[PDB]
Amino acid sequence: DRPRFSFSIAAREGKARTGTIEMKRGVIRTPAFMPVGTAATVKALKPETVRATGADIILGNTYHLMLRPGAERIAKLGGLHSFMGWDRPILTDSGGYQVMSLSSTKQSEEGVTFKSHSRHMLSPERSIEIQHLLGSDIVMAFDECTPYPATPSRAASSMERSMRWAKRSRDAFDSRKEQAENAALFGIQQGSVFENLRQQSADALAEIGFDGYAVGGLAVGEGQDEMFRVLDFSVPMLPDDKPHYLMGVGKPDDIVGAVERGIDMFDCVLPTRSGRNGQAFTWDGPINIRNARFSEDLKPLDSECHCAVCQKWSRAYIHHLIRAGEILGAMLMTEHNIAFYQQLMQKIRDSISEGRFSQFAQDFRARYFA
Amino acid sequence: DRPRFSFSIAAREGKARTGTIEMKRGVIRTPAFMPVGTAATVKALKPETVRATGADIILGNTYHLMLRPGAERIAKLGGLHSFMGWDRPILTDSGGYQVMSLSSTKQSEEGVTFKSHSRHMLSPERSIEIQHLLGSDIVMAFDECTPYPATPSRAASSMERSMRWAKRSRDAFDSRKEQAENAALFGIQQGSVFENLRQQSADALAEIGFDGYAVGGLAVGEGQDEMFRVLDFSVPMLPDDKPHYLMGVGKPDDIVGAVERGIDMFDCVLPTRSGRNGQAFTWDGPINIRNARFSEDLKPLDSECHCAVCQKWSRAYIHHLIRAGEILGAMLMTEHNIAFYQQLMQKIRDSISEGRFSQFAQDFRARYFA
């Protein structure tokens, strides 16, 4: 039987790693992409379809689920896995970001109170409890995603609060025996774009000790160059022997560059959301299927893609569906985009395993941005 | 290899029949329910899912497809079957009803001109041509669905025009060799609620000769009692040895009573449309899954239903999805409702085959309306 949590690195190339996380509900191949299932569904896909694309783990959200349908309700119904029909690992974000992104808020050292987009409360203790009620496999510490840009003073104050909250998150998780024995807890590094603060944050998190370490506070408007600059110094600060999770990233090229910088795990709404909007990922870059140029194009969305959508339907058909606002258009675009992302991750894993990831990254970029 | 068209009746009970229509693209078990795929998709379902529910044939619409994406376009792309990925029979309505239902129209003996809901034209010749371009397997004559209520004079004038159009439809279909050799043509009986006009219409259609005969002009607001009264005298007027198709019907009890009156084929948007709206069919009658009473109900939509949705997900989950406006809610409700309809048809076919359809109809009604 699989352990609660075990991360093993099978191969490395520079800062890049490939390996596996073993958990009770399944194995996660890294680097991993997690489709986002904010409201207990990966939008427009059955869980079996999510699995068919290659996903090993999906992401849920404490914030959304606590509002609808409710955390206690989901627990009464048997937990998130049973509720939505996904029996593999689920990582849940802690609310630390979504509350400030979506609500309409009172922040204090205790936590955050907010109006539902009714009054609600989050705190390290309540966040960890909600994630327990959901039956999350990977529980995220309750943090504060510092707005960007931030002054060094404000970034420091914010990060310091997040580190106090990280310790509270650790203690809350550990005090709940069933959770501590069956789930994993990841800490979240903050510090904005400042090396010294990132270092202090990493040191604080490592002192507390977590099963994995997220790089928080990025993909908040800073752009790729700056994100990569921050990753350059930030990822090496994290314990080498635990997974490194870059929250909310990203476009295919973001993922490739982040893996080059030591990231093992990703989540992003981009493939799902933009799929519904008509954007399809291809190895020659994204296309917008709504464009008139696709109205009579019999080719699949991507010429190499192995997904069921590309095996069966044309660009022309999907163009029609999306133009018409048909649900099947959302379904097909989403399945393809998530499959594309998983194929990207597979190519990344294989190339690192084979010691040719640098060449893959170069080839990928040359073609994607041709 | 299957013939262009062959209808065989395997068993009868009173006016009810069960049998098969063999066509080049597949066998259709009768009585049959055709899911509606107006815009080249059965809304929220992949064609494989439509097939998995038990459907042998689906319905498309000349009116919608001629507007978007265009009939000539679909022909250029290889026909409707290839375009949407359904390789089994497709019946297409002729436009005769939808143009007057949805457009904003100039009617004449030649046909109908109308504004797209751009100016367009339909006529017996153009309708048959569009259905050819789509590659329809069962082509419907271009008719006029008389509004309800109608005076006897207006119903007669309307029906007479439809019969002239039925002959034009026949001649247009026959003049197109590939269509005549590979597709079937059904005539549509009109005459409103008037026995003498229904008889005249049946006589006219039988004189022209068709592969099948639809009862048109019903499910236009007359209600079940009146519909059944009209069916009582109208269906026996049609040739016994050809399929009888009741257009646009209907609720489960409508279908049962119509089969009792000799109908072999049905189509209706009810299971798809109302599914997306939160109505689920069950053997104990319809439920609205949005209702708060389902928020923590772990039972499947229906206790006996064999569909994949009822095997896996709870009412509580689907309640959440529909409340949240999630696409997966539409998907699951629709798959279940279409599966329910197909199971109804299967029970009807089996009971007629076994000479216990009268008992089935009684048992069905007693429970459905308890």
Ligand SMILES: Nc1nc2cc3nc(NCCc4ccc(C(=O)O)cc4)[nH]c3cc2c(=O)[nH]1
């Ligand atoms: N707990 C926690 N969670 C986070 C989630 C994040 N998500 C992001 N970026 C997402 C950006 C984003 C937004 C929209 C789309 C799209 O619609 O395509 C894609 C990416 N940065 C994030 C930072 C944090 C963080 O520090 N702490």
Ligand SMILES: Nc1nc2cc3nc(NCCc4ccc(C(=O)O)cc4)[nH]c3cc2c(=O)[nH]1
């Ligand atoms: N060519 C032709 N086509 C028809 C289609 C029809 N469809 C109906 N009834 C549909 C009624 C209908 C409308 C909406 C819903 C729902 O949303 O649930 C269900 C049923 N009656 C109809 C009559 C004709 C006809 O004479 N000629």
Ligand SMILES: [Zn+2]
């Ligand atoms: Zn694909």
Ligand SMILES: [Zn+2]
């Ligand atoms: Zn069902």
